Design a protein around this ligand. Structure first.
Ligand code: CLA
Ligand code: CLA
Ligand code: CLA
Ligand code: CLA
Ligand code: CLA
Ligand code: CLA
Ligand code: CLA
Ligand SMILES: CC(=CC=C/C(C)=C/C=C/C=C(C)/C=C/C=C(C)/C=C/C1=C(C)CCCC1(C)C)/C=C/C1=C(C)CCCC1(C)C
Ligand SMILES: CC(=CC=C/C(C)=C/C=C/C=C(C)\C=C\C=C(C)\C=C\C1=C(C)CCCC1(C)C)/C=C/C1=C(C)CCCC1(C)C
Ligand SMILES: CC1=C(C/C=C(\C)CCC[C@H](C)CCC[C@@H](C)CCCC(C)C)C(=O)c2ccccc2C1=O
Ligand SMILES: CC1=C(C/C=C(\C)CCC[C@H](C)CCC[C@@H](C)CCCC(C)C)C(=O)c2ccccc2C1=O
Ligand SMILES: OC[C@H]1O[C@](CO)(O[C@H]2O[C@H](CO)[C@@H](O)[C@H](O)[C@H]2O)[C@@H](O)[C@@H]1O
Ligand code: SF4
Ligand code: SF4
Lengths: 154, 95, 81, 31, 30, 733, 75
C-alpha cells in the first residue's frame, strides 16, 4: 500500500523470488534418494520455506522492488504489530529483567557481612523476587515515581 | 502584483528614524565617548545599557516614513524641480 | 616543578606505609603535630627520575604524582648517555 | 685550505653546477 | 635553443632543501 | 651542554633529542611559554594570522597560475565534455618513457593531472574566459597577498599602535563585521556577479576597455531607485539558451524562473545574486545592533545579565558569561570552530544537489572529491572545536567567577550528561548491529527473504511534503490536491524545488531500507564521538581517579601505575581518542555517498537498494567491486592509465599500518634497546669520539599517541583520496 | 570485525574507561542499581591481554575463512 508495493495478494517481483532461488534448490536432478531415508532437501527445508506458497499467512507485508518485504509500522492500512505488538512485548519482558535487577539487589546491603554474596546467587535468578514482574500490574508505573525510589532517595 | 516599493518604502521607514541627530544638540557621536582609547575598565566587561531611552522621536520623526514614502515614491518624486538643467539634468519620469 | 607531583596525604607516618623510590625522598621532618609526627611531601628533589612508585603505597588521598616535571634534566631520565 | 670563511660559495657554486646544466639538456633523451 | 625549462624542481625539491637541512642545523648550532 | 631554543627554557637545555621535536610543536602555544604577556599573546596571535590571509593568496595565485599558458582553457570554454581538464605539468626524472602514455592527456603536450578542485568551473562560472583575455590571477591576488604581510609588520611595530586592550571589545567589532565585513562583502559581490559576469554568462563579453559604455540594458539603472524593482523578473533567461551565447538569452537580471537544464544543472545565473543582494540588507540591518560610542543600540551584557528565558523563577543564574567568553580566548576559538564545523558540511552537503557551477555533477568526479575535503576537515574541525572548549576549563575558567551560573551546573550536573549520551550510543550500537549481521546471516544462509529491512518512513516523508511527487499518495490535508498551498502557488516554488525523482540528478534520491541504516550509523558516530569529546571536555578538570587533574590540564598524558591503574586520561588523550570516531563517522557518511552516485550514474540504482541492506556486500560490491580499474594499473603488463593513484593507495595502506608501532609500542621498549644500541658507537672503531649533540632517546609518552595518528590519518585519508578518484574516473559508474 | 575491535583494546588508556565507568556508575546509583562489587576498568595489562588475543583470533580466522573457500571449489 505505502511506498513499496502491495502485500502478497500481488507482488510479481516477490513471486520470482519464491521460485528461482529456492526451487533450484532443485538443481539436483536427482541425487540419490529414490526411496532412501536421509537426505532432506527433498522434504521441507524447501517445503518449510516453500509450502509457504502464495500464502505466508498473508500479513499484508509491503514488499518493495526485488520484492523483499519492508516494514512500515505507522499504525494504519494494515501494519501495526510489526513494532508495537512485538514492541510492548520487548518492553514488558525487559524491565521485568531489571525490575528484578533492582530487586535481587535491593534485598541486600544488610544483616551481617554482605560483601559479594553476589558472585554466588542467594536465590538462583532470585527465585523469590521472581514473578514480581508479571506480578507487576501497574507497579513501577506508580510506586517507582511515588515513594521507595522516592525523590527523597533521588 | 508585488508591492516591491511596498517595502523599500518600508525600510527607509526606519533608517530616517535615522536622519536623527547629526543636527540637534551638540556634536557627532554623542561625541566619541569610548571608542578609541578604551573604556574604564569597564572591565568585565562592559557598559552601558538602558531599557529607558526609546522616546525622543517615537512621535516626531515617525513622520519621516511618509516623507519620500508619500509624494516622493509612488507619486512621482519632486515634480517641482528646475534649478540648472542643461549639462543635462532631467531626470525624466520613468513613471 | 621542576619536580612537582603531590603525594602528600595527612599522616605522613612512614611505617608499613612507604619507602620505595631511588634517593629522592629523605623526609621524616616532624611538623609540630601530625600523629606519628613526620610530614610534608619531599626533601631536595633535584636528584632523581620520575616514579609514582612514590605513592603506589602510603596515601596521597587526592592524586599521586607521575611524570609532571617537564623541565627535565637528564640525570633526570637514565639517558643522558 | 683557505677555508677561512667559506662553504657558502661551494654550496651555491658546486651545487648550481651539479644541477644547472645537470638538468636542462639540448634535445631530451627524455624521461 | 629548444626545450629547456627544468630548474624549478632541483632549486626547490633538491637545492632549497640542501640550504635548510644545512642552514637549519642552526637548531643544533650556528 | 649549551643554551638554545628561543622561547622556552626547560626545553632549551635538555640534552636529548626531545630538545628538537618538542621545539617543533610548542611554537604555536603562545599563552604561557616564557616569552608571553596578555598584551604579547593577543598581538602574538594577531600578526601571526596576518601571517595568515597571507599564505592563502600564495596558494590561490598559483592556482590561477598553473593555468593561463597550458592546462586547457581556450579549450574547456569551447564546450566542457567530461574529458580530463588540467592542473599542472607533472615533471619527475624518475618517470619512464611511458611519459607518452595517457599522463600526457590529449590537448596539452608534456604530462599533466587535471582540475578535480572546482576552480575550473568558477574562474569560468563567473565569466572570466578568453586566453588572450586571461592571464591575470597571481598579478592581482599576489599584489594583494603581500599587503597581507605588510600590516603583519606595520601592526607589529609598536608606535603606529599594534593595539592591546582594544582586543576584548566586541560590540564595536562584530557590530562592525556583520555589517562592514559580511554585508558589504556580500553586496560588493552582488555588485560583481551582476555588472561583470551575468552578462559574461548568458549574454556576451565586457571588454577590458569599457565599464561605463557597457550597460546591461539600453536606458540604464532606469527607475530602480524608483521603487519599481519588480520588472527585473520578466523574460529573464529562457532555456533554448545555448549557455554563454545569448540567442534565447534575453536580458533582465534577477529571477527565480525557468530552472534545471540537461545543458548545465547548477543554480540559475541571476538567483545567486538577488540572494547575495537580498541577504546584504539583513546583515547591514544586523550590523548596527550594538554600541560603538555614539549612544544608540546595545550593551552585550544587560541583555544577558538577567535576560534569560526559562530562568526568571527557576533558581539558575547567568553572571558575566561575557567576561568569561571574552577573558577566555578559547571559548573564543571553539565557538569559532563549529559554526564553521557545522556549516563546513552545510556548505559541502548543499554544494551537491545544489551545485552552483557551469558543468558540475554531470561531471561526477570533481563533484565527489570535493564533498569530502569539506567532510574531512568539518569532521576534522568539530573535534578541535570540542578540544579548545576543554582547554577553557583548565588554563582559563574560574569556578568562583562563573557559579550558580549556567556554564557551571553544566559542570556540576555532569555525571548524567555523559550517560544519557552513552545510553544513546550503546542503544544506537547493538541495534544497528543486530540489523546488518542478521541481514548478513540471512543471506549466505540462502534466505534473501527473512532479511530485516525497515523503510525510512520519516525520511521520504520529508519530501512528499515538498516536491517528491513520487507515484501519488494523499496525506490527510494535502491529497496531491484540493488543498494545495492556496496561499502559495505560481510565485516562489516554480520549476525549482521541483526536481522530484529525476533519475539522473533530482536533488533528492529516493530513499529505502539501505538508507535507514547508514543513516542510523552516521547517528551512532556523532554521539559516541561526542560522549568522548563531551566527556573529554566535561572534566579536563579532574575526577575520582584523578581528582586534582589540573594547572596544566590538557596534555599531561600518562600517570603512575597503581591507584586503579591510570592512563590516557588527559582531556587531550580523549581528544586523542576522539579523533578515531571523527575518522569513522566522516567515513561512514562519505563512504555512503558514492555507492549511490557511482551506481546512480553510468548505470543502475537497484544496486545500493538490496545490496546496502546488509554488510558483506558493502565489502564485496563496492570496496571489492570498483577498485578494479586502479590496481591492475601497475599490472604485470606495463603502467596503464593511473599509476600515481594505486601507488598512493599502497602508500595509503603503509603510512596507516605503520601508525600501529606508535600505538602498540609505548616508549619503554624503545628507549631500552637504544640503551644497548648506544653502547655500539661508543664501543666501535671508525665511529668513536664522533659526538652527537642530542642524546639518543625514545619518543615522549604523549608524542607517540599523536605520531601514530598524524600517521594513522594520512595513510587513511590518503587512501580514500586515491581510492575514490582511482575509481570514479574509469567508472563505470 | 573482531580484529577491528582489538585496536580498541590495544590502542587506549585506562583511567579512561574508569572516568567513563563512573558516569555510568552514577546513573546506576540514582535508580539504586550499582555499587556492590566495585565495578572497575581493565587491569592495564589485562587490557593488553584483550588486545593481542583478539587481534589474533580476529586477524587469523579471517584467512581460515579466506582459505576454505579457495580450495573447496576449483582448486
Ligand atoms: C582546510 C581547508 C580548505 C581548503 C584547502 C579549501 C579549498 C577549497 N575550497 Mg573550501 N572551505 C573550507 C576549508 C578549505 N577549503 C571551509 C572550512 C569552508 C566552510 C567555511 C569552506 C567552504 C567552501 C565553499 C563554499 C567553497 C569552497 C571551495 C573551495 C575550493 C575553491 C578554491 C579556493 O578556495 O580559493 C579561495 C578564494 C579566495 C580565498 C578569494 C575569494 C574570497 C572573496 C570572497 C574575497 C572577498 C573580499 C573582497 C575583496 C571584499 C570586497 C570589498 C569591496 C570590493 C566592496 C578549494 C578546493 C569552493 C568550491 O566549491 O570549489 C568547487 C566553494 O564551493 N570552500
Ligand atoms: C583553525 C584553528 C585552530 C587554531 C587557531 C588553533 C590554535 C591553537 N591550537 Mg589547536 N587544534 C585545532 C584548530 C586550531 N587550533 C584543531 C581542529 C584541532 C584538532 C581538530 C586542534 C588540536 C590542538 C591540540 C592538541 C593542541 C592545540 C593547541 C593549539 C594552540 C597551540 C597550537 C599548536 O600546538 O601547534 C603547534 C604544532 C606544530 C608547529 C606542528 C606539529 C603538528 C603536527 C600534529 C602535524 C599535524 C598533521 C600534519 C598536517 C601531518 C604532516 C603533513 C604531511 C603531509 C607530511 C593554539 C592555541 C595546543 C594547545 O595549546 O592546547 C593546550 C595543543 O594541545 N590544538
Ligand atoms: C569496530 C569495533 C569495535 C567495536 C565493536 C567497538 C565498540 C564500542 N566502542 Mg569502540 N573503538 C574501536 C573499535 C570498536 N569499538 C577502536 C578501534 C577505537 C579507537 C582505537 C575505539 C575507540 C572508542 C571510544 C573512545 C569509545 C568507544 C566506545 C565503544 C562502545 C560505544 C557504544 C556502542 O557503540 O554500542 C555498544 C557496542 C557494540 C554495538 C559492539 C558490540 C558489543 C556487543 C554486542 C558484544 C556481542 C556479544 C556476543 C554475542 C557475546 C560474545 C562475547 C563472548 C561471550 C564470546 C562500543 C562498545 C565508547 C564507549 O565506551 O561507550 C559507552 C567510547 O568510549 N570506542
Ligand atoms: C609497516 C611498518 C612499520 C615499519 C616500516 C616498521 C619497521 C620496523 N619495526 Mg615495527 N611495528 C609496526 C609497524 C612498522 N614497523 C607495528 C604496527 C608494530 C606493532 C603493532 C610494530 C612492532 C615492532 C616491534 C616490537 C619491533 C619493531 C621493529 C621494527 C624495526 C625492525 C628492523 C627493520 O627492518 O627496519 C628498517 C626497515 C623498514 C622499516 C622497512 C623498509 C622501509 C622502506 C619504505 C624504505 C624507506 C627508506 C628510504 C631511504 C626513505 C627515505 C626517503 C625520504 C623521502 C624520506 C623496523 C624499524 C623492531 C626493531 O626495531 O628491530 C630492529 C622491534 O622488534 N616493530
Ligand atoms: C606557493 C605556491 C604555489 C604552489 C603550491 C606552487 C607549486 C609549484 N610551482 Mg609555482 N609559482 C607560484 C605559486 C605556487 N607554485 C607563483 C606565484 C609563481 C609566479 C612567481 C610561480 C612560478 C613557477 C614557475 C616558473 C615554476 C613553478 C613551478 C612549480 C612546481 C615546482 C615547485 C617550484 O619550483 O615552484 C617555483 C615557484 C616560484 C618561482 C614562485 C616563488 C614565489 C614565492 C613567494 C613562493 C614560495 C612559497 C613557499 C611555500 C613559502 C610546483 C608544482 C615549476 C614547474 O613548472 O614545475 C612543474 C616552475 O618552475 N612555479
Ligand atoms: C539485535 C537484533 C535483532 C533483532 C530485532 C532480530 C530479530 C529477529 N531475528 Mg535475528 N539475528 C540477529 C539480530 C536480531 N534479530 C543477529 C545479530 C543475528 C546473527 C547472530 C541474528 C541471526 C538470526 C537467525 C538465524 C534467525 C533470526 C531470526 C530473527 C527473528 C526471530 C525472532 C523470533 O523467533 O520470535 C518468535 C517469538 C516471539 C516474537 C515472542 C526476529 C525477527 C530467525 C528468523 O526466523 O528470521 C527472521 C532466524 O532464526 N535471527
Ligand atoms: C520547514 C519549514 C518551515 C519553514 C522554514 C517554512 C518556510 C517558508 N514557507 Mg512554509 N510551511 C510549513 C513549514 C515551514 N515553512 C508548514 C508546516 C506548512 C503547512 C501549513 C507550510 C505552508 C506554506 C505555504 C502555503 C507557503 C509557505 C511559504 C513559505 C516561505 C515564505 C513565507 C513568507 O512569505 O514569509 C518560506 C520559505 C510560502 C511560499 O513561499 O511557498 C511558495 C507559501 O506558499 N509555507
Ligand atoms: C535553525 C535550525 C536548526 C538547528 C539546529 C541547531 C541550532 C544545531 C546546533 C548545533 C550546534 C552545535 C552542535 C555546537 C556544538 C558546540 C558545543 C556544544 C561546544 C561545547 C563546548 C565545550 C566542549 C565546553 C565549553 C566550550 C564549548 C562551548 C566550545 C533549523 C531550522 C529549520 C529546520 C532544520 C526545520 C525546518 C525549518 C528550518 C528553519 C529550516
Ligand atoms: C552482534 C552479536 C554477535 C556478533 C558476533 C560477531 C560479529 C563476530 C563474532 C565472532 C566470534 C568468534 C570469531 C568466535 C570464535 C571462534 C572460533 C570457533 C574460532 C576458531 C578458530 C580457531 C580454531 C583458531 C583460529 C582460527 C579460527 C578463528 C577459525 C550478538 C548480539 C546479541 C544481541 C543482539 C543481544 C543478545 C546477545 C547477542 C545475541 C549475542
Ligand atoms: C619506533 C618507536 C620509537 C622510536 C623512535 C624512533 C624510531 C624515531 C626514529 C626516527 C625516524 C626514522 C625519523 C623519520 C621521520 C621523517 C619523516 C623526518 C621527520 C621530520 C620532522 C621535523 C617532521 C619510540 O620512541 C616510541 C615511543 C612511544 C610509542 C611508540 C614508539 C615507537 O613505535
Ligand atoms: C574499551 C576498553 C576498556 C573498557 C572495557 C570493559 C569495561 C570490558 C569489560 C566488560 C565486561 C566483560 C562486561 C561484563 C558484564 C557481564 C559479564 C554481566 C552480565 C552477565 C551476562 C549474563 C551478560 C578497558 O577497561 C581498557 C583497559 C585497558 C586498556 C584498554 C581498555 C579498552 O580499550
Ligand atoms: O642540452 C644538453 C646538451 O648540451 C651538452 C651538455 O654538455 O653540451 C653541448 O655543448 C657543447 C659545447 O661546445 C656542444 O659542442 C655540444 O652541443 C655539447 O657538447 C651536451 O652534453 C648535451 O647533449
Ligand atoms: S602519605 Fe605517603 S609518604 Fe605521605 S605522609 Fe604518608 S606515607 Fe608519608
Ligand atoms: S616518585 Fe618521584 S620522587 Fe618519588 S621516587 Fe619516584 S621519582 Fe622519585
Amino acid at each position: 500500500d505505502i511506498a513499496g508495493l502491495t502485500p502478497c495478494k500481488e507482488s510479481k517481483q516477490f513471486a520470482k523470488r519464491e521460485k528461482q532461488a529456492l526451487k533450484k534448490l532443485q538443481a539436483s536432478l536427482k541425487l540419490y534418494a529414490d526411496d532412501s531415508a536421509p537426505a532432506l532437501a527433498i522434504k521441507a527445508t524447501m517445503e518449510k520455506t516453500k509450502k509457504r506458497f502464495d500464502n505466508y499467512g498473508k500479513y499484508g507485508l509491503l514488499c518493495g522492488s526485488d520484492g523483499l518485504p519492508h516494514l512500515i509500522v505507522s499504525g494504519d492500512q494494515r501494519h501495526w504489530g510489526e513494532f508495537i505488538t512485538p514492541g510492548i512485548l520487548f518492553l514488558y519482558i525487559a524491565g521485568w529483567i531489571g525490575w528484578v535487577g533492582r530487586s535481587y539487589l535491593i534485598a541486600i546491603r544488610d544483616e551481617k557481612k554482605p560483601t559479594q554474596k553476589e558472585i554466588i546467587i542467594d536465590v538462583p535468578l532470585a527465585s523469590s523476587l521472581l514473578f514480581r514482574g508479571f506480578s507487576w500490574p501497574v507497579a513501577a508505573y506508580r510506586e517507582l515515581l511515588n515513594g521507595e525510589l522516592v525523590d527523597n532517595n533521588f | 502584483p508585488s508591492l516591491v516599493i511596498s517595502l523599500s518604502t518600508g525600510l527607509s521607514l526606519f533608517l530616517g528614524r535615522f536622519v536623527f541627530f547629526n543636527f540637534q544638540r551638540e556634536n557627532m557621536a554623542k561625541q566619541v565617548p569610548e571608542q578609541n582609547g578604551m573604556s574604564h575598565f569597564e572591565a568585565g566587561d562592559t557598559r552601558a545599557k538602558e531599557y529607558v531611552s526609546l522616546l525622543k522621536s517615537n512621535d516626531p520623526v515617525g513622520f519621516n516614513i511618509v516623507d519620500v514614502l508619500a509624494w516622493g515614491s509612488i507619486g512621482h518624486i519632486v515634480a517641482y524641480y528646475i534649478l540648472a538643467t542643461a549639462s543635462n539634468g532631467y531626470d525624466p519620469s520613468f513613471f | 616543578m621542576s619536580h612537582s607531583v603531590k603525594i602528600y596525604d595527612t599522616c605522613i607516618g612512614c611505617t608499613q606505609c612507604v619507602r620505595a623510590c631511588p634517593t629522592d625522598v629523605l623526609e621524616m621532618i616532624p611538623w609540630g603535630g601530625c600523629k606519628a609526627k613526620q610530614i610534608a611531601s619531599a626533601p631536595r628533589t633535584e636528584d632523581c627520575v620520575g616514579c609514582k612508585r612514590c605513592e603506589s603505597a602510603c596515601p596521597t588521598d587526592f592524586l599521586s604524582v607521575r611524570v609532571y616535571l617537564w623541565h627535565e634534566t637528564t640525570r633526570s631520565m637514565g639517558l643522558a648517555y | 685550505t683557505k677555508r677561512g670563511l667559506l662553504l657558502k660559495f661551494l654550496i651555491l657554486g658546486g651545487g648550481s653546477l651539479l644541477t644547472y646544466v645537470s638538468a636542462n639538456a639540448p634535445q631530451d633523451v627524455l624521461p | 635553443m629548444i626545450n629547456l625549462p627544468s630548474l624549478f624542481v632541483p632549486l626547490v625539491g633538491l637545492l632549497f632543501p640542501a640550504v635548510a637541512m644545512a642552514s637549519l642545523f642552526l637548531h643544533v648550532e650556528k | 651542554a649549551l643554551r638554545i631554543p628561543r622561547f622556552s627554557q626547560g626545553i632549551a637545555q635538555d640534552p636529548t633529542t626531545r630538545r628538537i621535536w618538542f621545539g617543533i610543536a610548542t611554537a604555536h602555544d603562545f599563552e604561557s611559554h616564557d616569552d608571553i604577556t596578555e598584551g604579547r599573546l593577543y598581538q602574538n596571535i594577531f600578526a601571526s594570522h596576518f601571517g595568515q590571509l597571507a599564505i592563502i593568496f600564495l596558494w590561490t595565485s598559483g592556482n590561477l597560475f598553473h593555468v593561463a599558458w597550458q592546462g586547457n582553457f581556450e579549450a574547456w570554454v569551447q564546450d566542457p565534455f567530461h574529458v580530463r581538464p588540467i592542473a599542472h605539468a607533472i615533471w619527475d626524472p624518475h618517470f619512464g618513457q611511458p611519459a607518452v602514455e595517457a599522463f600526457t592527456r590529449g590537448g596539452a603536450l608534456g604530462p599533466v593531472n587535471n582540475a578535480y578542485s572546482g576552480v575550473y568551473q568558477w574562474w569560468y562560472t563567473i565569466g572570466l574566459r578568453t586566453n588572450e583575455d586571461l592571464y591575470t590571477g597571481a598579478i592581482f591576488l599576489l599584489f594583494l597577498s603581500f599587503i597581507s604581510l605588510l600590516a603583519g609588520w606595520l601592526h607589529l611595530q609598536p608606535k603606529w599602535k599594534p593595539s592591546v586592550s582594544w582586543f576584548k571589545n566586541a560590540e564595536s567589532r562584530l557590530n562592525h563585521h556583520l555589517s562592514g565585513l559580511f554585508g558589504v562583502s556580500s553586496l560588493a559581490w552582488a555588485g560583481h556577479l551582476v555588472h561583470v559576469a551575468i552578462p559574461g554568462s548568458r549574454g556576451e563579453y565586457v571588454r577590458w576597455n569599457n565599464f561605463l559604455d557597457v550597460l546591461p540594458y539600453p536606458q540604464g539603472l532606469g527607475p530602480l531607485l524608483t521603487g519599481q524593482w519588480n520588472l527585473y523578473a520578466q523574460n529573464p533567461s529562457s532555456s533554448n539558451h545555448l549557455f554563454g551565447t545569448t540567442q534565447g538569452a534575453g536580458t533582465a537580471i534577477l529571477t527565480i524562473l525557468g530552472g534545471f537544464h540537461p545543458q548545465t544543472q547548477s543554480l540559475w545565473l541571476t538567483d545567486v545574486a538577488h540572494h547575495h543582494l537580498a541577504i546584504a540588507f539583513l546583515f547591514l540591518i544586523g550590523g548596527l545592533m550594538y554600541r560603538t560610542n555614539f549612544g544608540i543600540g546595545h550593551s552585550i551584557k544587560y541583555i544577558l545579565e538577567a535576560h534569560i528565558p526559562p530562568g526568571g523563577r527557576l533558581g539558575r543564574g547567568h553572571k558575566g558569561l561575557y567576561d568569561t567568553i571574552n577573558n577566555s580566548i578559547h571559548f573564543q576559538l571553539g565557538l569559532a570552530l563549529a559554526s564553521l564545523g557545522v556549516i563546513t558540511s552545510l556548505v559541502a552537503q548543499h554544494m551537491y544537489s545544489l551545485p552552483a557551477y557551469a558543468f558540475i555533477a554531470q561531471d561526477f568526479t570533481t563533484q565527489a572529491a570535493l564533498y569530502t575535503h569539506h567532510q574531512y576537515i568539518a569532521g576534522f574541525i568539530m573535534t578541535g572545536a570540542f578540544a579548545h572548549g576543554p582547554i577553557f576549563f583548565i588554563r582559563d575558567y574560574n569556578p568562583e567567577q562563573n557559579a550558580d551560573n549556567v556554564l557551571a551546573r553544566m559542570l556540576e550536573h555532569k555525571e548524567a550528561i555523559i550517560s544519557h549520551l552513552s545510553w544513546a550510543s550503546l542503544f544506537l550500537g547493538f541495534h544497528t548491529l543486530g540489523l546488518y549481521v542478521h541481514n548478513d546471516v540471512m543471506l549466505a544462509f540462502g534466505t534473501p527473504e527473512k532479511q530485516i529491512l525497515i523503510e525510512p518512513i520519516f525520511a521520504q516523508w520529508i519530501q512528499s511534503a515538498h516536491g517528491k511527487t513520487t507515484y501519488g499518495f494523499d496525506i490527510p490535508l494535502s491529497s496531491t490536491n484540493g488543498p494545495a498551498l492556496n496561499a502559495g502557488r505560481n510565485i516562489w516554488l516554480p520549476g525549482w524545488l521541483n526536481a522530484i525523482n529525476e533519475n539522473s540528478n533530482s536533488l533528492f534520491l529516493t530513499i529505502g531500507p539501505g538508507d535507514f541504516l547508514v543513516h542510523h550509523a552516521i547517528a551512532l558516530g556523532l554521539h559516541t564521538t561526542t560522549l568522548i569529546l563531551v566527556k573529554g571536555a566535561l572534566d579536563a578538570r579532574g575526577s575520582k581517579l584523578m581528582p586534582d587533574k589540573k594547572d596544566f590540564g590538557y596534555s599531561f598524558p600518562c600517570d603512575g601505575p597503581g591507584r586503579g591503574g591510570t592512563c590516557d586520561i588527559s582531556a587531550w588523550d580523549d581528544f586523542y581518542l576522539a579523533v578515531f570516531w571523527m575518522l569513522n563517522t566522516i567515513g561512514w557518511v562519505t563512504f555512503y555517498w558514492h555507492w549511490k552516485h557511482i551506481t546512480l550514474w553510468r548505470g543502475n540504482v537497484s544496486q545500493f537498494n538490496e545490496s546496502s541492506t546488509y554488510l558483506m556486500g558493502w565489502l564485496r560490491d563496492y570496496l571489492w567491486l570498483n577498485s578494479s580499474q586502479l590496481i591492475n594499473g601497475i599490472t604485470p603488463l606495463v603502467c596503464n592509465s593511473l599509476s600515481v593513484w594505486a601507488w598512493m593507495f599502497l602508500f595509503g595502506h603503509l603510512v596507516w599500518a605503520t601508525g600501529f608501532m606508535f600505538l602498540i609500542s609505548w616508549r619503554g621498549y624503545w628507549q631500552e634497546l637504544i640503551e644497548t644500541l648506544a653502547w655500539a658507537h661508543e664501543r666501535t672503531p671508525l665511529a668513536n669520539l664522533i659526538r652527537w649533540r642530542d642524546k639518543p632517546v625514545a619518543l615522549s609518552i604523549v608524542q607517540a599517541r599523536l605520531v601514530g595518528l598524524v600517521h594513522f590519518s594520512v595513510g587513511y585519508i590518503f587512501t580514500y583520496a586515491a581510492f575514490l578518484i582511482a575509481s570514479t574516473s574509469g567508472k563505470f559508474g | 570485525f573482531v580484529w577491528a575491535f582489538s585496536l580498541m583494546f590495544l590502542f587506549s588508556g585506562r583511567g579512561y574507561w574508569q572516568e567513563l565507568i563512573e558516569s555510568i556508575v552514577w546513573a546506576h546509583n540514582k535508580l539504586k542499581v550499582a555499587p556492590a562489587t566495585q565495578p572497575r576498568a581493565l587491569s592495564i595489562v589485562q587490557g593488553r591481554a584483550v588486545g593481542v588475543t583478539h587481534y589474533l583470533l580476529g586477524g587469523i580466522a579471517t584467512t581460515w575463512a579466506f582459505f576454505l573457500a579457495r580450495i573447496i571449489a576449483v582448486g
